[PDB]
Amino acid sequence: RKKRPEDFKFGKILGEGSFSTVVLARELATSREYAIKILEKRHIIKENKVPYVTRERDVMSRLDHPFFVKLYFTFQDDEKLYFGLSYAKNGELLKYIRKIGSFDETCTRFYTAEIVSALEYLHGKGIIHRDLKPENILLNEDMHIQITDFGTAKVLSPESKQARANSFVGTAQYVSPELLTEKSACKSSDLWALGCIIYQLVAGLPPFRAGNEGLIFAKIIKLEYDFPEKFFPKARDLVEKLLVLDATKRLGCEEMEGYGPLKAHPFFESVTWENLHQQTPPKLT
Ligand SMILES: Nc1ncnc2c1ncn2[C@@H]1O[C@H](COP(=O)(O)OP(=O)(O)OP(=O)(O)O)[C@@H](O)[C@H]1O
Ligand SMILES: O=C(O)/C=C(/CCc1ccc(Cl)cc1)c1ccccc1
């Protein structure tokens, strides 16, 4: 039996999207806390947003991994749709970057490793995220990552050995050159975004920065960026192996033989991959 709005006591708003509100809720029968994402049916129908909502449900239903926000249940009433999600108490990674300014090497390594571990799982299921960015990497009460925002994700079809997807989605600062030039994204598009994120953790800002999208696009396709002084040398090597225009030459992509070579990069020398989600994350700074 599907859950109903009356099964929950709703509390504070956790965040607002263009077409959605995420509210903290306690399930009355269990006292469990969920982040419940609510959308108005009329609104999403009028704004042609329905395939984003069905895409989110469909992609999240396939995922079962400690580094992703979990979809526990969905339900609907006359006016609304509801996603019952795990509550990431500590919110967006982005706000930590802003307040601290720049992660030290141990924190950069730890969070990068968790993102790499998440992407390995996601790509192993044939799913491209397409909107990987600090605002979409949430943190749970233990400060592990919880990647979210799957309305713009794509399940590639195994049956047709599908490698490329054609919807133009994502966030300008993290969009891959192939999406700008070839008008399609692939799993390697996420590794481009990973490179931007590692750079941002260390430098404080993502690498292709400008006051508007068009200027950012022009820089992306020219690979127009540089490192600040004091960028950790092993991180720099890794970023240069990810921010590569040719999508088939990025460390971790299928044509470069996958995640083994990525996980083996000297930047991750100290990392115990196997139990990341049970390790205590390093204290931020
Ligand atoms: N499981 C969760 N736990 C805690 N906070 C969450 C969770 N899911 C989302 N949030 C918060 O709610 C905000 C809004 O999320 P939502 O998915 O509704 O829209 P969005 O993706 O932020 O915006 P848009 O749809 O306009 O791109 C998020 O940015 C995040 O801060
Ligand atoms: O999963 C369900 O219980 C059913 C739906 C209903 C599918 C649907 C989609 C869009 C609209 Cl306008 C109406 C109904 C749902 C889909 C996504 C998120 C939450 C609930």
PDB file of C-alpha atoms in Angstrom, residues 1 143 231 247:
ATOM      1  CA  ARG A   1       0.000   0.000   0.000  1.00  0.00           C
ATOM      2  CA  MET A 143      29.695  13.714   6.328  1.00  0.00           C
ATOM      3  CA  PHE A 231      47.717  23.506  -6.346  1.00  0.00           C
ATOM      4  CA  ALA A 247      36.192  12.370 -24.365  1.00  0.00           C
TER       5      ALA A 247
END
